[PDB]
C-alpha cells in the first residue's frame, strides 16, 4: 500500500475537524487531541489516506520528524493564524529542509476575514505552494488531495 | 475583475464537456467546437471562470498565443491520449516557454484503462506538475481550480 505519513501542526483555536468531514465523514463538541492519528480511498492513486495534533516543548519536536506533509491550517480570517509562518520554520528546522507544504486557510462561512484571502496569497507567492475551507464539506478533500499532489512530486 | 485566459487543446475523441459539468453545469449528444469560448465564481479568489477547441494547420497556432494555462486532457485509458506530450511542445513552441500546465486524464468510470494512472504519473514526475475526471461531476472543478492554483504562481 502506497501510503503517505503527513501531518498538520496549527494556530490557536480553529479546527482535527477539516478531515472530520472526511475519515469519519461528517461534521461534529469535543475538543481535540493528543496526537489522534488514524489511517484510511482512490485521482486514481492507491493511498491509505492524517495524524491530528493540538490547537509542545519536546513532543512537537518528536512526532514531527516522521512527516511528509505539514500543510498547516489556520482560519482565513484570524489575526494570529497565517501569522502563526510561525509554524513553518520549525518544520524546516526539524527535517532540515528549506518541504511538503501548502497554506490552508480555514473558515469562510462565518463572515469576518482580517486575513483577506488575497493577503496570505502573497505569502503563497514567495512560498510557491493557499486554500479556504469548512467541514460543515466542499474544498476540504480538494486541498488534502492537493496535498497528495505535491508529495508524489517530492 | 481578476480573470484568467487559459485554454485546453487535446487528444482525438474524449471530452468541451469536463467544464460542461460546470459553466452551464450539467452533463450533456452534440459534437463540439469551433473555438467555443465563454466566461463565468469564488478558494476565496475573485475570478471570471474556458475557451474550448476541437477534438489546426494555422488556427491552433493562432488562438493559442493568448493563453495562460493549457493543461490538456485525454481519457486515462486511451492509447493515443497522453501519447498525444504530442500536444505539449507546440504550446512550449508558441509562447516560447519551456508553462502553465497539468496532466489531466479523463474518464475512469468506464472500466478499461491502458493508461494506468500511475503510468502517466512518471510523465508527471519529470514535468513536476496529473488528474482523472468525468462530467456525468467530482474532481472536474478540483482540477481546473487546481489550474487556478499554479497560474497565480506564474
Ligand atoms: N465556522 C466554522 N467552524 C468550523 C469549521 N471547521 C471546523 N469548525 C469548528 O472548529 C472548532 C475548534 O477547533 P479544534 O477542532 O479544536 O482545532 P485545533 O485547536 O486547531 O486542533 C470547533 O468548534 C468546530 O465545531 C469551519 O470551516 N467553519
Ligand atoms: N464515459 C465518459 N464520457 C464522458 C466523460 N466526459 C465526457 N464524456 C463524453 O465525451 C464525448 C466526446 O468528446 P467531445 O466532447 O467531443 O471532446 P473533444 O473531441 O476532445 O473536443 C461525449 O460522448 C461525452 O458524452 C467522462 O468522464 N466519461
UniProtKB/Swiss-Prot annotation, chains A, B:
| Result of changing residue 13 to R | In SFM; somatic mutation; shows constitutive activation of the MAPK and PI3K-AKT signaling pathways
The N-acetylmethionine modification is found at 1
Task: Quote the cellular component terms of the Gene Ontology held in the record.
Answer: ciliary basal body; cytoplasm; cytosol; endoplasmic reticulum membrane; glutamatergic synapse; Golgi apparatus; Golgi membrane; GTPase complex
Q: Which Gene3D superfamilies match?
A: P-loop containing nucleotide triphosphate hydrolases (3.40.50.300)
Q: What is the effect of changing residue 30 to F?
A: Loss of interaction and recruitment to plasma membrane of PLCE1
Location(s) in or outside the cell:
Cell membrane; Golgi apparatus; Golgi apparatus membrane
Q: Which SUPFAM superfamilies match?
A: P-loop containing nucleoside triphosphate hydrolases
Q: Which residues carry this modification: S-nitrosocysteine?
A: 108
- InterPro entries, alphabetically? P-loop_NTPase, Small_GTP-bd, Small_GTPase, Small_GTPase_Ras-type
Enzyme Commission number(s) of this protein: 3.6.5.2
Known consequence of changing residue 37 to C? No effect on interaction with PLCE1
Q: Assign the protein's first listed, main location to one coarse class.
A: membrane
Residues binding GTP, per UniProt: 13-17, 28-33, 54-55, 106-109, 134-136
Catalysed reaction(s)? GTP + H2O = GDP + phosphate + H(+)
Coiled-coil annotated spans: none
**Which top class of enzyme applies to this chain?**
hydrolase
Q: Name one GO biological process term.
A: chemotaxis
Q: Please describe the quaternary structure of this protein.
A: In its GTP-bound form interacts with PLCE1. Interacts with TBC1D10C. Interacts with RGL3. Interacts with HSPD1. Found in a complex with at least BRAF, HRAS, MAP2K1, MAPK3 and RGS14. Interacts (active GTP-bound form) with RGS14 (via RBD 1 domain). Forms a signaling complex with RASGRP1 and DGKZ. Interacts with RASSF5. Interacts with PDE6D. Interacts with IKZF3. Interacts with RACK1. Interacts with PIK3CG; the interaction is required for membrane recruitment and beta-gamma G protein dimer-dependent activation of the PI3K gamma complex PIK3CG:PIK3R6. Interacts with RAPGEF2.
Q: Which family does it belong to?
A: Belongs to the small GTPase superfamily. Ras family.
Say what the protein does. Involved in the activation of Ras protein signal transduction. Ras proteins bind GDP/GTP and possess intrinsic GTPase activity.
Q: Which disease is it linked to?
A: Costello syndrome: A rare condition characterized by prenatally increased growth, postnatal growth deficiency, intellectual disability, distinctive facial appearance, cardiovascular abnormalities (typically pulmonic stenosis, hypertrophic cardiomyopathy and/or atrial tachycardia), tumor predisposition, skin and musculoskeletal abnormalities.
Q: What is this protein called?
A: GTPase HRas
The scientific name of the source species is Homo sapiens (Human)
Amino acid at each position: 500500500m502506497t501510503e503517505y505519513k503527513l501531518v498538520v501542526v496549527g494556530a490557536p483555536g480553529v479546527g482535527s475537524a477539516l478531515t472530520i468531514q472526511l475519515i469519519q465523514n461528517h461534521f461534529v463538541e469535543y475538543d481535540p487531541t493528543i496526537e489522534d492519528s488514524y489511517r484510511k480511498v482512490v485521482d486514481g492513486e492507491t493511498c491509505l489516506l492524517i495524524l491530528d495534533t493540538a490547537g509542545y516543548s519536546a513532543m512537537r519536536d518528536q512526532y514531527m520528524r516522521t512527516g511528509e506533509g505539514f500543510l498547516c491550517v489556520f482560519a482565513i480570517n484570524n489575526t494570529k493564524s497565517f501569522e502563526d509562518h510561525q509554524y513553518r520554520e520549525q518544520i524546516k528546522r526539524v527535517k532540515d529542509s528549506d518541504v511538503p507544504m501548502v497554506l490552508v486557510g480555514n473558515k469562510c462561512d462565518l463572515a469576518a476575514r482580517t486575513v483577506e484571502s488575497r493577503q496570505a496569497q502573497d505569502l503563497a507567492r514567495s512560498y510557491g505552494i493557499y486554500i479556504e475551507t469548512s467541514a460543515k464539506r466542499q474544498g476540504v478533500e480538494d486541498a488534502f488531495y492537493t496535498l497528495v499532489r505535491e508529495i508524489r512530486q517530492h
